[PDB]
UniProtKB/Swiss-Prot annotation:
Keyword Lipoprotein: no
Gene name of the encoded protein: CPB1
Full protein stretch here: 114 to 416 of 416
Residue sites binding substrate per the record: H155, A156, R157, E158, R213, N230, R231, S284, Y285, Y335
The protein's name: Carboxypeptidase B
MF term (GO), any: zinc ion binding
Length: 395
C-alpha cells in the first residue's frame, strides 16, 4: 500500500455523482464511505482509496472537473504500519490488541472454561471455507430468559468491530457480582455474542488483503469471490442499492441467505425468535447509530421510540470522551440499501434493531490503531448498557 492515498471528495449535485461513475469505470477506486458510487447522494462527502499508480490521474480528473477534494491519508503504508501499536508484550490474546482468528477461536474456548457459570459456547454452523461459527451465550443460566443478540465482524476489514464483541465479554465477566446493573442484566437476560460473523474474510484481511470486506465464497461463471453479508438478507433482498455482479463489493449474493454464514445466523435467530428482544450489529467506521429502514423510505411504527433511544444512547456514549455520534433511519441517514440484517431482524418482530458504526470519522477509517481499542470500547459499552437497560424495562 506504499504511496496509496485516501481521498475525501465533496459532491454537490447529481452531475458530480455521474462524473464519479465515469471515474470509477476508468480507475479501480476502493470506496470506504459510502460503500459504492451508486450510494452517493448530493451534498455529501465520499471517502475512497486510490492505487499508487492512479494517484496523478485522479487528482487531475477531480481538478479538471471541479470536484473539491481533500487527502485524508497521504500514505496508507504508514497507517498500516502504525496500526499494531499495542503497548502489550503478549504473543497471545489481548483485549487491547487485534487478535487473528486462531487467537480468537482459542479465546472463545478459554473464556468459556474459565467462566463456565456465566458463559456457554456453540457453533451455529460452518463458514464457506469450513471454519466454525462460534456463538457465546452470556448470562446466568435461567428458566425462560429474554435475550439480546449482538454480532461483530460482518465486514472483514472493520477490525474494531471484532475487537468490541471481545471487550464486551470481558466486561460482562469482570463486573458480575460487582456492578449492580451488569449483574442484574446477566441475571435477567442472556446475551448472545457472535464475535466474528465473516471468519473467512477476516482471515483473508490478515493473510492477503487488509482491505477486503465480503465473504470468501466462490461465484459461478466468474473468478470473482464473495457476497456482501449485509446485502444477503431477506429484507427487500437486492431490490435497491445492491448489485448482481459478483465482482462488485455490493454483490447481494445469488439468493437471499445464499451464504452459509448468513443462513446460520438467520436460522439461529429464527429458532430463538420468541426470546430475542433486541438485535445489535457492530460495524465501522463513521460514528453513527442506524435503525430501520435501509431498504425503504418507510419509517418503522416504532420510529419515535427508536429515535429517542438512539438519541439517549449517543448522549451516554459521549460522556466518556466527548465522541460525537449521529443517528437516524438508514435510508435517509445514508441512502437506501436492501438485504441488511438490522432490517430483516426488525421485520421478524424484533422491535429494537440497531447498527452501530464505530470510530473514527475518517482519520484512519478502517485502519484504526490498537491504541484506540480500549477508549473506543469503553464508550460503546455505555451506549450498549443504556439500551440493555432500556429493553429490560420494556420486555
Ligand atoms: Zn460494515
Amino acid at each position: 500500500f506504499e504511496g496509496e492515498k485516501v481521498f475525501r471528495v465533496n459532491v454537490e449535485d447529481e452531475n458530480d455523482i455521474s462524473e464519479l461513475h465515469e471515474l470509477a469505470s476508468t480507475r479501480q477506486i476502493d470506496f470506504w464511505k459510502p460503500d459504492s458510487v451508486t450510494q452517493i447522494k448530493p451534498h455529501s462527502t465520499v471517502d475512497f482509496r486510490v492505487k499508487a499508480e492512479d494517484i496523478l490521474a485522479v487528482e487531475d480528473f477531480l481538478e479538471q472537473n471541479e470536484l473539491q477534494y481533500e487527502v485524508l491519508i497521504n500514505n496508507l503504508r504508514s497507517v498500516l504500519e502504525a496500526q499494531f501499536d499495542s503497548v502489550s508484550r503478549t504473543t497471545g490474546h489481548s483485549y487491547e490488541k487485534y487478535n487473528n482468528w486462531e487467537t480468537i477461536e482459542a479465546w472463545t474456548e478459554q473464556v468459556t472454561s474459565k467462566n463456565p457459570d456465566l458463559i456457554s459456547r456453540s457453533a451455529i454452523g460452518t463458514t464457506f471455507d469450513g471454519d466454525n461459527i462460534y456463538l457465546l451465550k452470556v448470562g446466568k443460566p435461567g428458566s425462560n430468559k429474554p435475550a439480546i443478540f449482538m454480532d461483530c465482524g460482518f465486514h472483514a476489514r472493520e477490525w474494531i468491530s471484532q475487537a468490541f464483541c471481545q471487550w464486551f465479554v470481558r466486561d460482562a465477566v469482570r463486573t458480575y457480582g460487582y456492578e449492580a446493573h451488569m449483574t442484574e442484566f446477566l441475571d435477567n437476560l442472556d446475551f448472545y455474542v457472535l464475535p466474528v460473523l465473516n471468519i473467512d474474510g477476516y482471515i483473508y484481511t490478515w493473510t492477503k488483503n487488509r482491505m477486503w470486506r465480503k465473504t470468501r465464497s466462490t461465484n459461478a461463471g466468474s473468478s470473482c469471490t464473495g457476497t456482501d453479508p449485509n446485502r444477503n438478507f431477506n429484507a427487500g433482498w437486492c431490490t435497491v442499492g445492491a448489485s448482481v455482479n459478483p465482482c462488485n463489493e455490493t454483490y447481494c449474493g445469488s439468493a437471499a441467505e445464499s451464504e452459509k454464514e448468513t443462513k446460520a445466523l438467520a436460522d439461529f435467530i429464527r429458532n430463538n425468535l420468541s426470546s430475542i428482544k433486541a438485535y445489535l450489529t457492530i460495524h465501522s467506521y463513521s460514528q453513527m447509530i442506524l435503525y430501520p429502514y435501509s431498504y425503504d423510505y418507510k419509517l418503522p411504527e416504532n420510529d419515535a421510540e427508536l429515535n429517542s433511544l438512539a438519541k439517549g444512547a449517543v448522549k451516554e456514549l459521549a460522556s466518556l470522551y466527548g465522541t460525537s455520534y449521529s443517528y437516524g433511519p438508514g435510508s435517509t441517514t445514508i441512502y437506501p440499501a436492501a438485504g441488511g440484517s438490522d432490517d430483516w431482524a426488525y421485520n421478524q418482530g424484533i422491535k429494537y434493531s440497531f447498527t452501530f458504526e464505530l470510530r473514527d470519522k475518517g482519520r484512519f477509517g478502517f485502519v484504526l490503531p490498537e491504541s484506540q481499542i480500549q477508549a473506543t470500547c469503553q464508550e460503546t459499552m455505555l451506549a450498549v448498557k443504556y439500551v440493555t437497560n432500556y429493553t429490560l424495562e420494556h420486555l
